[PDB]
Amino acid sequence: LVPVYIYSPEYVSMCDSLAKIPKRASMVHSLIEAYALHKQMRIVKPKVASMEEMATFHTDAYLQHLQKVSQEGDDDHPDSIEYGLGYDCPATEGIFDYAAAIGGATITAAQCLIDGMCKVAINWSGGWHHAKKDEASGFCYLNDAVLGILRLRRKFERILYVDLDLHHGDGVEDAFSFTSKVMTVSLHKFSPGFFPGTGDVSDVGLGKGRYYSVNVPIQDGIQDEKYYQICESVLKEVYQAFNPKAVVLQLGADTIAGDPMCSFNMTPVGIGKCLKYILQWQLATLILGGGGYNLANTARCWTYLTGVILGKTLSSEIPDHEFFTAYGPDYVLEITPSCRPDRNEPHRIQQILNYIKGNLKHVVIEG
Numbered sequence: 001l002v003p004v005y006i007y008s009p010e011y012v013s014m015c016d017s018l019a020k021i022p023k024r025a026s027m028v029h030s031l032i033e034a035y036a037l038h039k040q041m042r043i044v045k046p047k048v049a050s051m052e053e054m055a056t057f058h059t060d061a062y063l064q065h066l067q068k069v070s071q072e073g074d075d076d077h078p079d080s081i082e083y084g085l086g087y088d089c090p091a092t093e094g095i096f097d098y099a100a101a102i103g104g105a106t107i108t109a110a111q112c113l114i115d116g117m118c119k120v121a122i123n124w125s126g127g128w129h130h131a132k133k134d135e136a137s138g139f140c141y142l143n144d145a146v147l148g149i150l151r152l153r154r155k156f157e158r159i160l161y162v163d164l165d166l167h168h169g170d171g172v173e174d175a176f177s178f179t180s181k182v183m184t185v186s187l188h189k190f191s192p193g194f195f196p197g198t199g200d201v202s203d204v205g206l207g208k209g210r211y212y213s214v215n216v217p218i219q220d221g222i223q224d225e226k227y228y229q230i231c232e233s234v235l236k237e238v239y240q241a242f243n244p245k246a247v248v249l250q251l252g253a254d255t256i257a258g259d260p261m262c263s264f265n266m267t268p269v270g271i272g273k274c275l276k277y278i279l280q281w282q283l284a285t286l287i288l289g290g291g292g293y294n295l296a297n298t299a300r301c302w303t304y305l306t307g308v309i310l311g312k313t314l315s316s317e318i319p320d321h322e323f324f325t326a327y328g329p330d331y332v333l334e335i336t337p338s339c340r341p342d343r344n345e346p347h348r349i350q351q352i353l354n355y356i357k358g359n360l361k362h363v364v365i366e367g
Protein backbone atom coordinates (compact mmCIF):
# COMPACT_ATOMS: atom_id res chain seq x y z
CA LEU A 1 0.00 0.00 0.00
CA VAL A 2 2.66 2.55 1.13
CA PRO A 3 5.76 3.14 -1.04
CA VAL A 4 9.27 2.29 0.20
CA TYR A 5 11.82 5.15 0.23
CA ILE A 6 15.40 3.82 0.26
CA TYR A 7 17.43 6.08 2.59
CA SER A 8 20.10 6.34 5.26
CA PRO A 9 22.18 9.43 6.18
CA GLU A 10 25.37 7.43 5.46
CA TYR A 11 24.05 6.39 2.04
CA VAL A 12 23.32 10.05 1.17
CA SER A 13 26.73 11.31 2.40
CA MET A 14 28.37 8.62 0.28
CA CYS A 15 26.35 9.66 -2.77
CA ASP A 16 26.98 13.37 -2.01
CA SER A 17 30.69 12.94 -2.76
CA LEU A 18 30.12 11.97 -6.41
CA ALA A 19 31.91 14.20 -8.90
CA LYS A 20 29.76 16.39 -11.21
CA ILE A 21 26.68 16.13 -8.89
CA PRO A 22 28.13 17.30 -5.53
CA LYS A 23 25.61 17.22 -2.64
CA ARG A 24 22.77 16.33 -5.03
CA ALA A 25 21.54 13.35 -2.98
CA SER A 26 21.38 15.62 0.08
CA MET A 27 19.48 18.32 -1.81
CA VAL A 28 16.94 15.83 -3.11
CA HIS A 29 16.32 14.15 0.28
CA SER A 30 16.42 17.52 2.04
CA LEU A 31 13.60 18.84 -0.20
CA ILE A 32 11.55 15.63 0.12
CA GLU A 33 11.80 15.89 3.94
CA ALA A 34 10.91 19.60 3.74
CA TYR A 35 7.65 18.77 1.96
CA ALA A 36 7.10 16.13 4.71
CA LEU A 37 6.73 13.34 2.14
CA HIS A 38 8.96 10.89 4.05
CA LYS A 39 6.20 10.86 6.72
CA GLN A 40 3.96 9.04 4.17
CA MET A 41 6.60 6.43 3.09
CA ARG A 42 8.30 3.39 4.63
CA ILE A 43 11.94 4.45 5.06
CA VAL A 44 14.30 1.47 4.51
CA LYS A 45 18.07 1.59 5.16
CA PRO A 46 19.87 0.17 2.12
CA LYS A 47 22.18 -2.81 2.31
CA VAL A 48 25.59 -2.78 0.72
CA ALA A 49 25.93 -5.15 -2.23
CA SER A 50 28.30 -8.05 -1.70
CA MET A 51 30.84 -9.01 -4.36
CA GLU A 52 28.68 -12.06 -5.25
CA GLU A 53 25.64 -9.81 -5.80
CA MET A 54 27.56 -7.39 -8.05
CA ALA A 55 29.13 -10.34 -9.87
CA THR A 56 25.61 -11.41 -11.02
CA PHE A 57 26.20 -8.95 -13.91
CA HIS A 58 29.73 -7.60 -13.70
CA THR A 59 32.82 -9.70 -14.42
CA ASP A 60 35.11 -10.58 -11.52
CA ALA A 61 38.00 -8.92 -13.40
CA TYR A 62 36.17 -5.59 -13.55
CA LEU A 63 34.98 -5.52 -9.92
CA GLN A 64 38.46 -6.45 -8.68
CA HIS A 65 40.06 -3.61 -10.70
CA LEU A 66 37.43 -1.12 -9.54
CA GLN A 67 38.29 -2.16 -5.97
CA LYS A 68 42.05 -1.69 -6.42
CA VAL A 69 41.68 1.71 -8.03
CA SER A 70 39.35 2.84 -5.19
CA GLN A 71 41.93 2.30 -2.38
CA GLU A 72 44.99 3.78 -4.07
CA GLY A 73 44.61 6.09 -7.12
CA ASP A 74 44.94 6.10 -10.90
CA ASP A 75 48.71 6.78 -11.18
CA ASP A 76 50.07 3.15 -10.80
CA HIS A 77 47.22 1.60 -12.88
CA PRO A 78 47.37 2.33 -16.62
CA ASP A 79 45.22 -0.85 -16.80
CA SER A 80 42.29 1.60 -16.08
CA ILE A 81 41.51 2.60 -19.72
CA GLU A 82 40.64 -1.05 -20.46
CA TYR A 83 37.87 -0.94 -17.80
CA GLY A 84 36.40 2.39 -18.90
CA LEU A 85 38.01 4.69 -16.32
CA GLY A 86 39.10 7.83 -18.30
CA TYR A 87 37.97 11.49 -18.17
CA ASP A 88 34.31 10.34 -18.61
CA CYS A 89 34.71 8.15 -15.47
CA PRO A 90 37.41 9.37 -13.03
CA ALA A 91 39.40 6.69 -11.22
CA THR A 92 38.92 8.55 -7.91
CA GLU A 93 39.33 7.17 -4.38
CA GLY A 94 36.31 5.58 -2.65
CA ILE A 95 34.39 4.77 -5.86
CA PHE A 96 34.05 1.01 -5.21
CA ASP A 97 32.24 1.74 -1.92
CA TYR A 98 29.92 4.21 -3.72
CA ALA A 99 29.19 1.56 -6.35
CA ALA A 100 28.46 -1.18 -3.81
CA ALA A 101 26.22 1.25 -1.87
CA ILE A 102 24.23 2.35 -4.93
CA GLY A 103 23.90 -1.22 -6.24
CA GLY A 104 22.87 -2.24 -2.73
CA ALA A 105 20.11 0.38 -2.50
CA THR A 106 18.65 -0.73 -5.82
CA ILE A 107 18.94 -4.42 -4.79
CA THR A 108 17.25 -3.64 -1.46
CA ALA A 109 14.44 -1.84 -3.25
CA ALA A 110 13.89 -4.84 -5.54
CA GLN A 111 13.91 -7.11 -2.47
CA CYS A 112 11.19 -5.01 -0.82
CA LEU A 113 9.12 -5.50 -4.00
CA ILE A 114 9.62 -9.32 -4.11
CA ASP A 115 8.62 -9.67 -0.44
CA GLY A 116 5.29 -7.83 -1.03
CA MET A 117 6.37 -5.02 1.38
CA CYS A 118 5.13 -2.44 -1.25
CA LYS A 119 4.01 -1.89 -4.89
CA VAL A 120 6.52 0.98 -5.37
CA ALA A 121 10.13 1.31 -4.17
CA ILE A 122 12.31 4.38 -4.65
CA ASN A 123 16.09 4.93 -4.91
CA TRP A 124 16.70 8.39 -6.44
CA SER A 125 20.50 8.04 -6.10
CA GLY A 126 20.38 5.05 -8.51
CA GLY A 127 19.80 4.92 -12.30
CA TRP A 128 23.41 4.36 -13.51
CA HIS A 129 22.18 3.07 -16.86
CA HIS A 130 25.40 3.19 -18.97
CA ALA A 131 27.68 0.75 -17.09
CA LYS A 132 28.66 -2.45 -18.91
CA LYS A 133 29.56 -5.85 -17.51
CA ASP A 134 33.31 -5.08 -17.66
CA GLU A 135 33.48 -1.37 -18.39
CA ALA A 136 32.41 1.85 -16.71
CA SER A 137 30.79 4.40 -19.02
CA GLY A 138 29.27 7.90 -18.83
CA PHE A 139 29.98 8.33 -15.12
CA CYS A 140 28.28 4.96 -14.35
CA TYR A 141 30.67 2.61 -12.51
CA LEU A 142 28.12 -0.14 -11.85
CA ASN A 143 24.74 -0.83 -13.45
CA ASP A 144 22.46 -0.80 -10.43
CA ALA A 145 19.39 -0.89 -12.69
CA VAL A 146 20.53 -4.24 -14.16
CA LEU A 147 21.17 -5.69 -10.66
CA GLY A 148 17.68 -4.74 -9.54
CA ILE A 149 16.18 -6.28 -12.68
CA LEU A 150 18.06 -9.54 -12.01
CA ARG A 151 16.81 -9.54 -8.39
CA LEU A 152 13.18 -8.93 -9.48
CA ARG A 153 13.52 -11.85 -11.92
CA ARG A 154 13.39 -14.29 -8.96
CA LYS A 155 9.66 -13.54 -8.52
CA PHE A 156 8.56 -11.84 -11.76
CA GLU A 157 8.78 -13.71 -15.10
CA ARG A 158 8.73 -10.72 -17.49
CA ILE A 159 10.17 -7.28 -16.51
CA LEU A 160 9.85 -3.90 -18.26
CA TYR A 161 12.64 -1.32 -18.09
CA VAL A 162 11.61 2.23 -19.03
CA ASP A 163 14.30 4.87 -19.36
CA LEU A 164 13.20 8.53 -19.52
CA ASP A 165 16.68 9.98 -19.02
CA LEU A 166 17.85 12.23 -21.82
CA HIS A 167 20.49 9.64 -22.66
CA HIS A 168 20.00 6.24 -24.25
CA GLY A 169 19.89 3.53 -21.56
CA ASP A 170 22.53 1.53 -23.40
CA GLY A 171 24.13 -0.44 -20.56
CA VAL A 172 20.79 -1.87 -19.48
CA GLU A 173 19.68 -2.56 -23.06
CA ASP A 174 22.99 -4.31 -23.85
CA ALA A 175 22.67 -6.53 -20.78
CA PHE A 176 19.32 -7.89 -21.95
CA SER A 177 19.60 -7.52 -25.77
CA PHE A 178 19.58 -11.31 -26.27
CA THR A 179 16.56 -12.06 -24.05
CA SER A 180 12.79 -11.68 -24.22
CA LYS A 181 12.38 -11.99 -20.43
CA VAL A 182 13.28 -8.29 -20.01
CA MET A 183 12.00 -5.52 -22.33
CA THR A 184 13.95 -2.23 -22.47
CA VAL A 185 12.25 0.99 -23.60
CA SER A 186 14.32 4.18 -23.89
CA LEU A 187 13.26 7.69 -24.95
CA HIS A 188 16.37 9.80 -25.62
CA LYS A 189 18.13 12.40 -27.67
CA PHE A 190 19.75 10.84 -30.76
CA SER A 191 22.06 13.16 -32.71
CA PRO A 192 25.47 13.05 -34.42
CA GLY A 193 28.11 13.10 -31.66
CA PHE A 194 25.64 13.02 -28.74
CA PHE A 195 26.42 10.42 -26.08
CA PRO A 196 26.41 7.46 -26.12
CA GLY A 197 25.79 7.42 -29.92
CA THR A 198 23.43 4.42 -29.72
CA GLY A 199 19.68 3.85 -29.64
CA ASP A 200 18.23 4.64 -33.07
CA VAL A 201 14.69 3.29 -33.68
CA SER A 202 16.13 0.35 -35.69
CA ASP A 203 17.82 -0.82 -32.46
CA VAL A 204 15.48 -3.72 -31.67
CA GLY A 205 17.66 -6.37 -29.96
CA LEU A 206 19.28 -9.57 -31.12
CA GLY A 207 18.64 -13.33 -31.28
CA LYS A 208 15.81 -14.31 -28.95
CA GLY A 209 15.53 -10.66 -27.79
CA ARG A 210 14.84 -9.21 -31.28
CA TYR A 211 11.89 -6.76 -30.87
CA TYR A 212 12.43 -6.81 -27.06
CA SER A 213 14.43 -3.57 -27.18
CA VAL A 214 12.51 -0.32 -27.97
CA ASN A 215 14.21 2.98 -28.79
CA VAL A 216 12.54 6.33 -29.49
CA PRO A 217 15.02 8.88 -30.92
CA ILE A 218 13.88 12.46 -30.13
CA GLN A 219 15.43 15.80 -31.18
CA ASP A 220 16.05 18.97 -29.12
CA GLY A 221 13.38 21.18 -27.65
CA ILE A 222 10.57 18.73 -27.00
CA GLN A 223 7.99 19.81 -24.40
CA ASP A 224 5.59 18.05 -22.04
CA GLU A 225 2.57 17.68 -24.35
CA LYS A 226 4.43 16.04 -27.27
CA TYR A 227 6.70 13.82 -25.12
CA TYR A 228 3.71 12.36 -23.26
CA GLN A 229 1.87 11.68 -26.56
CA ILE A 230 4.97 9.80 -27.69
CA CYS A 231 5.45 8.08 -24.33
CA GLU A 232 1.82 7.00 -23.87
CA SER A 233 1.54 5.83 -27.49
CA VAL A 234 4.64 3.56 -27.09
CA LEU A 235 3.81 2.31 -23.55
CA LYS A 236 0.25 1.41 -24.61
CA GLU A 237 1.64 -0.87 -27.37
CA VAL A 238 4.27 -2.35 -25.01
CA TYR A 239 1.81 -3.18 -22.21
CA GLN A 240 -0.44 -5.04 -24.67
CA ALA A 241 2.38 -6.97 -26.38
CA PHE A 242 4.78 -7.70 -23.52
CA ASN A 243 2.30 -7.98 -20.59
CA PRO A 244 4.95 -7.23 -17.92
CA LYS A 245 4.73 -8.40 -14.30
CA ALA A 246 7.13 -5.78 -12.82
CA VAL A 247 8.67 -2.43 -13.85
CA VAL A 248 12.00 -0.62 -13.38
CA LEU A 249 11.71 3.05 -14.23
CA GLN A 250 14.68 5.41 -14.68
CA LEU A 251 13.68 9.09 -14.39
CA GLY A 252 16.85 11.05 -15.03
CA ALA A 253 16.02 14.76 -14.90
CA ASP A 254 18.57 15.89 -17.51
CA THR A 255 15.54 16.24 -19.81
CA ILE A 256 14.32 19.15 -17.72
CA ALA A 257 14.42 22.75 -18.92
CA GLY A 258 17.48 24.59 -17.63
CA ASP A 259 19.72 21.54 -17.51
CA PRO A 260 23.30 22.12 -18.69
CA MET A 261 22.73 19.35 -21.36
CA CYS A 262 20.37 21.95 -22.77
CA SER A 263 18.58 19.56 -25.16
CA PHE A 264 14.98 18.73 -24.21
CA ASN A 265 12.51 21.30 -22.87
CA MET A 266 10.54 19.24 -20.37
CA THR A 267 9.04 20.08 -17.02
CA PRO A 268 8.37 17.63 -14.17
CA VAL A 269 4.64 17.82 -14.95
CA GLY A 270 5.23 16.09 -18.29
CA ILE A 271 7.38 13.32 -16.80
CA GLY A 272 4.74 12.97 -14.06
CA LYS A 273 2.12 12.11 -16.66
CA CYS A 274 4.36 9.29 -17.95
CA LEU A 275 4.89 8.14 -14.36
CA LYS A 276 1.14 8.20 -13.61
CA TYR A 277 0.49 6.20 -16.77
CA ILE A 278 2.92 3.46 -15.54
CA LEU A 279 1.51 3.52 -11.99
CA GLN A 280 -2.13 2.93 -13.13
CA TRP A 281 -0.88 -0.55 -14.25
CA GLN A 282 -0.69 -1.42 -10.52
CA LEU A 283 2.49 -3.51 -11.04
CA ALA A 284 5.50 -3.82 -8.74
CA THR A 285 7.56 -0.73 -9.63
CA LEU A 286 11.20 0.20 -8.85
CA ILE A 287 11.86 3.94 -9.23
CA LEU A 288 15.36 5.23 -9.99
CA GLY A 289 16.98 8.57 -10.65
CA GLY A 290 19.91 9.04 -13.01
CA GLY A 291 21.12 12.14 -14.76
CA GLY A 292 20.17 15.64 -13.73
CA TYR A 293 22.83 18.32 -13.64
CA ASN A 294 20.91 21.45 -12.70
CA LEU A 295 20.80 20.20 -9.11
CA ALA A 296 17.93 22.36 -7.80
CA ASN A 297 15.80 21.57 -10.86
CA THR A 298 16.69 17.87 -10.38
CA ALA A 299 15.48 18.06 -6.74
CA ARG A 300 12.35 20.00 -7.76
CA CYS A 301 11.63 17.27 -10.31
CA TRP A 302 12.22 14.22 -8.18
CA THR A 303 10.37 15.78 -5.24
CA TYR A 304 7.37 16.61 -7.45
CA LEU A 305 7.46 13.01 -8.77
CA THR A 306 7.49 11.61 -5.22
CA GLY A 307 4.35 13.70 -4.85
CA VAL A 308 2.66 11.95 -7.77
CA ILE A 309 3.57 8.48 -6.42
CA LEU A 310 1.88 9.45 -3.14
CA GLY A 311 -0.99 11.24 -4.92
CA LYS A 312 -0.31 14.52 -3.04
CA THR A 313 -0.35 18.05 -4.51
CA LEU A 314 2.66 19.98 -3.23
CA SER A 315 2.64 23.73 -2.63
CA SER A 316 4.20 26.02 -5.26
CA GLU A 317 6.28 27.93 -2.67
CA ILE A 318 9.54 26.12 -1.77
CA PRO A 319 9.72 25.39 1.99
CA ASP A 320 12.67 26.82 3.92
CA HIS A 321 15.30 24.08 4.50
CA GLU A 322 19.11 23.55 4.41
CA PHE A 323 19.51 24.43 0.67
CA PHE A 324 16.81 27.13 0.25
CA THR A 325 19.19 29.59 -1.54
CA ALA A 326 19.77 27.18 -4.47
CA TYR A 327 16.09 27.64 -5.50
CA GLY A 328 16.72 31.29 -6.52
CA PRO A 329 15.56 33.58 -7.89
CA ASP A 330 11.86 32.55 -7.79
CA TYR A 331 11.79 29.96 -4.93
CA VAL A 332 9.01 27.83 -6.45
CA LEU A 333 8.70 24.15 -7.41
CA GLU A 334 7.47 24.69 -10.99
CA ILE A 335 9.98 24.79 -13.84
CA THR A 336 9.44 27.02 -16.88
CA PRO A 337 10.22 25.81 -20.38
CA SER A 338 13.02 27.71 -22.18
CA CYS A 339 12.19 29.62 -25.38
CA ARG A 340 13.96 27.29 -27.74
CA PRO A 341 12.27 25.73 -30.71
CA ASP A 342 10.93 22.17 -30.85
CA ARG A 343 13.06 20.51 -33.58
CA ASN A 344 10.79 17.40 -33.69
CA GLU A 345 8.96 17.39 -37.02
CA PRO A 346 5.52 15.71 -36.60
CA HIS A 347 5.84 13.56 -39.77
CA ARG A 348 9.15 12.05 -38.53
CA ILE A 349 7.53 11.34 -35.13
CA GLN A 350 4.57 9.58 -36.79
CA GLN A 351 6.96 7.33 -38.84
CA ILE A 352 8.75 6.48 -35.55
CA LEU A 353 5.55 5.61 -33.70
CA ASN A 354 4.32 3.37 -36.56
CA TYR A 355 7.67 1.55 -36.96
CA ILE A 356 7.51 0.72 -33.22
CA LYS A 357 3.82 -0.32 -33.48
CA GLY A 358 4.94 -2.80 -36.16
CA ASN A 359 7.95 -4.09 -34.25
CA LEU A 360 5.60 -4.76 -31.32
CA LYS A 361 3.24 -6.75 -33.61
CA HIS A 362 6.05 -9.31 -33.93
CA VAL A 363 6.01 -9.77 -30.10
CA VAL A 364 2.30 -10.81 -30.19
CA ILE A 365 2.47 -12.85 -33.46
CA GLU A 366 5.58 -14.81 -32.23
CA GLY A 367 4.21 -15.51 -28.68
Ligand SMILES: CC1(C)CN(C2CCCC2)C(=O)N1c1ccccc1/C=C/C(=O)NO
Binds near residue numbers: 088292
Ligand atom coordinates in the same frame (compact mmCIF):
# COMPACT_ATOMS: atom_id res chain seq x y z
C1 LIG B 1 30.27 13.40 -16.57
C2 LIG B 1 28.83 13.86 -16.90
C3 LIG B 1 27.88 12.83 -16.31
C4 LIG B 1 28.49 15.24 -16.32
N1 LIG B 1 28.17 16.08 -17.49
C5 LIG B 1 27.76 17.48 -17.29
C6 LIG B 1 28.95 18.30 -16.72
C7 LIG B 1 28.81 19.70 -17.35
C8 LIG B 1 27.42 19.71 -18.05
C9 LIG B 1 27.31 18.26 -18.55
C10 LIG B 1 28.28 15.34 -18.60
O1 LIG B 1 28.07 15.73 -19.74
N2 LIG B 1 28.63 14.08 -18.35
C11 LIG B 1 28.78 13.06 -19.26
C12 LIG B 1 30.04 12.90 -19.78
C13 LIG B 1 30.33 11.90 -20.67
C14 LIG B 1 29.34 11.02 -21.04
C15 LIG B 1 28.06 11.15 -20.53
C16 LIG B 1 27.72 12.15 -19.60
C17 LIG B 1 26.27 12.17 -19.16
C18 LIG B 1 25.58 11.02 -18.83
C19 LIG B 1 24.15 10.98 -18.48
O2 LIG B 1 23.39 11.94 -18.46
N3 LIG B 1 23.56 9.81 -18.19
O3 LIG B 1 22.16 9.84 -17.91
Ligand SMILES: [K+]
Binds near residue numbers: 164165168169186187
Ligand atom coordinates in the same frame (compact mmCIF):
# COMPACT_ATOMS: atom_id res chain seq x y z
K1 LIG C 1 16.43 7.32 -22.00
Ligand SMILES: [K+]
Binds near residue numbers: 178180181209212
Ligand atom coordinates in the same frame (compact mmCIF):
# COMPACT_ATOMS: atom_id res chain seq x y z
K1 LIG D 1 15.51 -7.45 -24.17
Ligand SMILES: [Zn+2]
Binds near residue numbers: 166167254290291
Ligand atom coordinates in the same frame (compact mmCIF):
# COMPACT_ATOMS: atom_id res chain seq x y z
ZN1 LIG E 1 21.49 11.43 -18.94
